[model samples]
Target: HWGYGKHNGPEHWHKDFPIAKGERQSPVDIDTHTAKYDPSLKPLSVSYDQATSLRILNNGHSFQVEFDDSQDKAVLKGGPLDGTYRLLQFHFHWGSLDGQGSEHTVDKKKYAAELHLVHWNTKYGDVGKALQQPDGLAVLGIFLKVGSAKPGLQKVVDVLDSIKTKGKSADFTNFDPRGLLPESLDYWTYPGSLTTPPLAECVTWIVLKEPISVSSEQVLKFRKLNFNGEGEPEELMVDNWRPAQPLKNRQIKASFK
Candidate 1:
């Protein structure tokens, strides 16, 4: 199985999933100086409904808060997207150490953690069907820095103890994913693949330029989670981030000049 372990980690993923080496792979390094600003890029808009959050679970990779996406109750639009994308769930990637958890980097710099809000295109039907198409998914990336405490993030962290093992889940409702966003919506957009396996080259990545705050204590709480399921050999989840991949021939666009 694909994991973050030294043997089964990202380096070995290409063996099981060849697309792991595909062009347009995600979590790319955004060279701010080289990123071109396109004036035509519009501001991104999001309308999230607090009640749509259904549950929280530890999927052996990361803890994700699943949302009710049966309808467009929570949608992301504008920016580089041609149509609205529905929010499916939001999860995070963090390090075993401080100052190096985020997947997508800026000027080769890393953050304490990174948040991913996974969304699927409506034109492709459900997220399942959307995954196969080139324009199927849109993942919003937000870097997290350790400093002040974020109550919004704390709300999710407060429940981590309850779902500490892989496959464990608990009812988590009325949580608005929007609370996790940074103040500014300015972002870097590019065509990319999922950082994890099956690594579909179908994502339109929108990574925010600004970072949100999270205390080091809050990040420590995440390390308390287990990557292995209960009753198995215990393995604490840490460094769940994939390193930045080659940009290939793709161009990274900026929403602001």
Candidate 2:
């Protein structure tokens, strides 16, 4: 129960997928008893440039802010990766349950929102090819909390109205993702899959332990977002977060105690 597709051949399950789903996907509840800390793990190293910023769009499911992934200049390294991973695009999920929007929880406790910074392995040449391998994608996650207005988040929130409908897009630049992260870089590492369809299991989860703070105003702003193009009654864009999936036979590792 701890080796390969058939305990040794490939990562495929049911002889159908190459580590595709049928096993591990994301936003799982982290029970401490299942968490093993590793000191040999290296600290994360990430770099970005504000100029490479492209357009921000309302992808219906979530608002995605894409970058110039033409190359691997903006990359994340050192952590659970053996090779460099290029920054693909970043997005968010929220539900304003009065406050319960986060997908992954600690002991089933929810959060106000969650952010995802998607990156792909450069060794695989491109994101597409990368997805074919088990180490294809890496998603950095940061959970949002109830606090004073998040100074950096306002840069994103202020433009939400401009991209209020599905397929809508707007110019967004000079926004550094470093500002979107919490003070601590400590994280949890594990093998997980995309929560969306096709539901590929190529992502190596790098979920940060410390969370970024977001006030009620910001949380409310997210709910006000519409899931589809206008002309129809507004379908409030809340509950965008996926529920936790089963952990299967995988192990979760903590970078810090």
Candidate 3:
């Protein structure tokens, strides 16, 4: 029932999910000046070749590409993380307009969209069990700016029409998500929650400092996907991002000075 509309949007999420107002809620504004440079943090390492991507689905909230996380094939390590975390799924959040989609902002500035790579700590066995712990998840956030088209992203954009309605899905495999990242791996990390409901306070957010580019024409295609199902009333799936939440008492640490 939770949606991006006025009635069920982020503002109303607290009614059913009280943890929406929890201290570690995610998608917080990264005030570059205040983000401390932590020398102890190591460079983030990602090995995703064995990630057998399954399909792309319109989950009503956002279109996500689910991966086969059966083993420790595709794992993320180093950085603020202690051990290996399995790559689960990756999704995107975008706005109806050109410059307002990204959930996390830098110095109060917004981008065209944001991408989240969700991972679960292998120590917990599975994602279901991992979700219950504070350090269960490690989500890598990347901002997408409007510019030229990225070849890696174009593959995803080409398949939008196949999954135009909610619950609709299509076979999407062999797509390497690493190609979606920018050249720089420098990031700012902190303790936060899932941007959407149940609003679990178990995510360790690693947000990239540099953003990748997506053409204006390409981003417009994302707006064509419908939030409603085949028989339901038509509603465009845009502005699917939750706004930046309060930082509270958390400290954001940067991997770079």
For all the candidates, what are their Cα RMSDs to the real structure? 0.9, 6.9, 0.7
Task: Give residue 26's error in model 2 in angstroms.
Answer: 1.2
Using all chains and alpha carbons, the TM-scores for the candidates as numbered come to 0.98, 0.89, 0.99
Per-residue CA lDDT of model 1 for 4-33, tens digit only, reads: 999899999999999888888988999999
On lDDT, the leading prediction is 3
Error of 3 at 210 (Å): 0.6
Residue-wise C-alpha lDDT for candidate 3, range 48-81, written one tens digit per residue: 8787888999888899998999988788999999
For model 2, what is the error of residue 141's alpha carbon versus the real structure, in angstroms, after optimal superposition? 0.4
Q: Mind giving the per-residue lDDT tens digits that candidate 2 earns over 32-103? A: 666899888899987775326678999887899888888866788888888889887889888748458787
Q: Could you tell me the TM-score of candidate 3?
A: 0.99
Any runs in candidate 3 off by more than 4 Å, and if so which?
none
Ten residues in a row with the worst lDDT in model 2? 1-10
**Which wins on TM-score, candidate 2 or candidate 3?**
3
Report the poorest 10 consecutive residues by lDDT, candidate 3: 46-55
